[PDB]
Design a protein around this ligand. Sequence first.
Ligand SMILES: [Ca+2]
Length: 258
Amino acid sequence: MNWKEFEVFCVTYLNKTYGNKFAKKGESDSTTSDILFTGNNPFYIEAKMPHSQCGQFVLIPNRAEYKFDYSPKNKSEINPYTQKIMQFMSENFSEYANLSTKGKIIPLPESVFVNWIKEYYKSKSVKFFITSNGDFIIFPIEHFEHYFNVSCTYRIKKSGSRHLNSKSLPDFKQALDKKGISYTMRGLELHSDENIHDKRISGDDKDFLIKENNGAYHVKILSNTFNANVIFSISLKNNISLFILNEDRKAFEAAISL
DNA sequence: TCCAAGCGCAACG
DNA sequence: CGTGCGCTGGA
Ligand SMILES: [Ca+2]
């Protein structure tokens, strides 16, 4: 299944096992998780597939000072583990200053990255993670290292898309005309009997992406921002201690009962 | 309202 | 197993 189906799978399990107290609804944002326990001891639960990413921060190369600057637009504050990563990269500036989409791994002790993850998720009121290796695994953030292997890389990650808007509609219609695609627009919704799912077309310094929705196509404008971020990858361990697993399930059962 | 940017997410070539 | 779109400050 994909990650969206996986998150629904996790929420459904929580509600059927522990009662209808686990919300995944409404708007989200990066300062919180996607699943909220709505009891007297509220907290967020992070669902992670066995192979996932697990947080990031943008660093800007300063080629005059030969160091990396923490982006003032990042959404989490510098903690000591952020500082260790930045210090390592800055002391090795030449090796990290040529940004790449392939990325360059950061060979610091895994505990530095685990500690960054713990700090970051604690700061977002994420107290537990849920994953699955065939059975559901729920554990508190303080025991993260017993469940996931962690690595860290610095890579260009292009920023995300935005919905086609009225201001861009003329350029998009003209891009369709240029590409020879037969179409009709109903507001910002695109209609065509051509097979244009995932189609990319460009015009007037905008790269457009076309995706099939219920009965029509939705149009997105892709980004032109190509900054680089430290970003964490996690892989579920094959050898999780059953003793830790059991005490961690009891920790969760305590947390939802306070 | 719109755009740049950062964080969400494993996806997929 | 070695790359970026969907979503959410300030002008
Ligand atoms: Ca990595």
